[PDB]
Amino acid sequence: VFYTPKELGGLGMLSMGHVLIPQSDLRWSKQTDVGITHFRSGMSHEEDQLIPNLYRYIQPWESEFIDSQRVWAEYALKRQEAIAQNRRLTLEDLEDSWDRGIPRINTLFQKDRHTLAYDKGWRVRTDFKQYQVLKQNPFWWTHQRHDGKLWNLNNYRTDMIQALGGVEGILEHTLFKGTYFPTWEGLFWEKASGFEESMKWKKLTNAQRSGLNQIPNRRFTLWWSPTINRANVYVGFQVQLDL
């Protein structure tokens, strides 16, 4: 329920730690014409599934700098031959070096790359923004537009879905099979209800507004109800609903 990405109803937590998934959580079952068939995920005789760690999916600073120097020398050469041939870098020549340099090659193709060339002292200004805004900025040291996005979580999320058993393994924990959707393909969430979003601005009291900010949780608990509401996880007596 924690490390499932937000698109599948989970919280999308990022783990800088060592969490083991019990094998009993990697089992699902589906019904077809021949009856009910049960599936696991760990065919290989390995240990219990271990969620990917945000440790491994970040390139170290030293390798990052070496890559930046190599990539920028390569770009300097490519530009040198581009000027000679009266051509411009067509985003295909710069395919092997896309998310590598410290000023990410992404920034060279940014749409607003002309107005940012007149933006000077942006790192000092970003650092000094702490004296104007009442929220601390974790990325106080860098700017996404100027310096690029110096990290990627595509591999992390891919391995997180793979480690949890994929969509089939994840959604056995949810009320998805209770919705009787034929498939998960043409599906979309609605983050705010049609009426819940209309009440964000209707002059509600502090108590009235505080209780309305817990509505999404009432859905989250519903999404993971087959797993949260279990005898294994909540030891003790059980009470059935009156109807």
């Binding site: 783990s15 730690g17 060592h18 969490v19 083991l20 019990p22 009993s24 219990d48 990917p52 760690n53 440790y55 491994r56 999916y57 970040i58 390139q59 170290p60 390798s63 990627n152 591999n155 391995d159």
Partner: peptide, 22 residues
């Protein structure tokens, strides 16, 4: 099986930080 996030001080120290990244 508890689901508690265990510290990796000394755990998973064999692998580098460049692994599983492209």
């Amino acid at each position: 099986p508890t689901g508690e996030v265990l510290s990796l001080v000394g755990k998973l120290e064999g692998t580098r930080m460049g692994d599983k990244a492209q």
